[PDB]
């Protein structure tokens, strides 16, 4: 319905010894609580990540954008994780080397026009090296405010 819901509790720092699935369940958790996705959303993102990985080997901060099928989404939402230390995602391009991910953009979008808008915003944002480093030092409020400003465009 064109809007993207992004709330202050959709931004979190994660503990160190978290696996890939741990991350995915933790980022999907506030989306589930808010009723923005089906209740077993994490399972679908996990299963999708295994066959179609979402790691982007960009420098200096590795990124992933895990997601699943739009038919599991109820309202557009985005969920953001900051990793204490890298966790490998497989490379979205089919390179053998894993991606040491520090920043995770979980996407729960059901509108095609919002999907493409967000993907394009992410490609731009991850090439802003100052901004990507900032994400590793800012707290949750500064991350939310920072992303909110840049996303609000549409």
């Amino acid at each position, epitope marked *: 319905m064109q809007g993207i819901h992004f709330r202050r509790h959709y931004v979190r720092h994660l503990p160190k010894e978290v696996s890939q699935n741990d991350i995915i369940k933790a980022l999907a958790s506030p989306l589930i609580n808010d009723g923005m996705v089906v209740s077993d959303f994490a399972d679908h993102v996990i299963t999708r990540e295994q066959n179609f990985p979402t790691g982007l080997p960009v420098e200096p901060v590795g990124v992933a954008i895990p997601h699943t099928d739009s038919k599991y989404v109820r309202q557009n939402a985005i969920s953001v994780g900051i990793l204490a230390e890298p966790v490998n995602f497989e490379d979205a391009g089919g390179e053998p080397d894993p991606v040491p991910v520090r920043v995770v953009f979980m996407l729960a979008l059901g*509108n*095609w026009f919002d999907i*493409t808008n967000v*993907l394009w915003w992410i490609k731009a944002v991850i090439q802003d090296e100052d901004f990507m480093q900032q994400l590793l030092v800012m707290n949750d409020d500064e991350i939310y405010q920072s992303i909110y400003t840049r996303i609000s465009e549409l």
Partner: antibody
Framework: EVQLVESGGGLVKPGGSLRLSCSAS????????MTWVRQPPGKGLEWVGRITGPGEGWSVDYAAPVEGRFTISRLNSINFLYLEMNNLRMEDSGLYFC??????????????????????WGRGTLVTVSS | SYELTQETGVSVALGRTVTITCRGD??????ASWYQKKPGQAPILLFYGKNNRPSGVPDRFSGSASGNRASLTISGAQAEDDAEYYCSSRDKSGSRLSVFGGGTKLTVLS
């Protein structure tokens, strides 16, 4: 074997109205984006308009010469797509096609809102607008 | 051929290779998709995006893209390839509308 079957075309006077139908089978219609396309006599394909899916609140977009006059709707319970045409003009004459519509966006090189392509097509229904 | 411009007509000897082109400013931002059509028959999706070919489409059909140009190469034209070919894309960079090229009549000297 996807099946698309258009009907309703016929002779109309300029200023008149006409309602096209598109029967659809063999795929997930309720989630399919659907496009109407037309070929005026002896000319090429012309994009008419397109209706999206549930994730997009079933929004519709129209070709410039056709906005306001044409209406694209759907009833998913019977897998039917419709095109409502009012205040018809000579140059509205043509073979009208319905088409199951896919969506494409390449992450690294793409630009919003990506592109739409037409993977399945019906055989058409003929519209003649004339005095 | 309004926003998207195609050659009116091109011919190619049977067996030989021919590239047909599609030009417009929106192609600087958007990929084109390609369609074959013959009189009396429904169109057929040949190619779309960066490098996608539907199954059942012969591999002699290949699309590519550069600058404001999209192109469809037919490598070793058969008789049944004698047809009209249409390109399609956004009418404008960033647009939700779509548009077709005016079409190219390809004659295969068979």
């Amino acid at each position: 074997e996807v099946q698309l079957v258009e009907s309703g075309g016929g002779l109309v006077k300029p200023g008149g109205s006409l309602r096209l139908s598109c029967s659809a089978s063999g795929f997930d219609f309720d989630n399919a984006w659907m496009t109407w396309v037309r070929q005026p006599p002896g000319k090429g394909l012309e994009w008419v308009g397109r209706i999206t899916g549930p994730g997009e609140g079933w929004s519709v977009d129209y070709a410039a010469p056709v906005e306001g006059r044409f209406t694209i709707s759907r009833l998913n319970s019977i897998n039917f797509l419709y095109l409502e045409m009012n205040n018809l003009r000579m140059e509205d004459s043509g073979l009208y096609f319905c088409a199951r519509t896919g969506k494409y966006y390449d992450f690294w090189s793409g630009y919003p809102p990506g592109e739409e392509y037409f993977q399945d097509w019906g055989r058409g229904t003929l519209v003649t607008v004339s005095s | 051929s309004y926003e998207l411009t195609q050659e009116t007509g091109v011919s190619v000897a049977l067996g030989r290779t021919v590239t047909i082109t599609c030009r417009g400013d929106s192609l600087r931002s958007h990929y084109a998709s390609w369609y074959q059509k013959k009189p009396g028959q429904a169109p057929i999706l040949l190619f779309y995006g960066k490098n996608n070919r539907p199954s059942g489409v012969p591999d002699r059909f290949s699309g590519s893209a550069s600058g404001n140009r999209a192109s469809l190469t037919i490598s070793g034209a058969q008789a049944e390839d004698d047809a009209e070919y249409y390109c399609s894309s956004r009418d404008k960079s960033g647009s939700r509308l779509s548009v077709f090229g005016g079409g190219t009549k390809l004659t295969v000297l068979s």
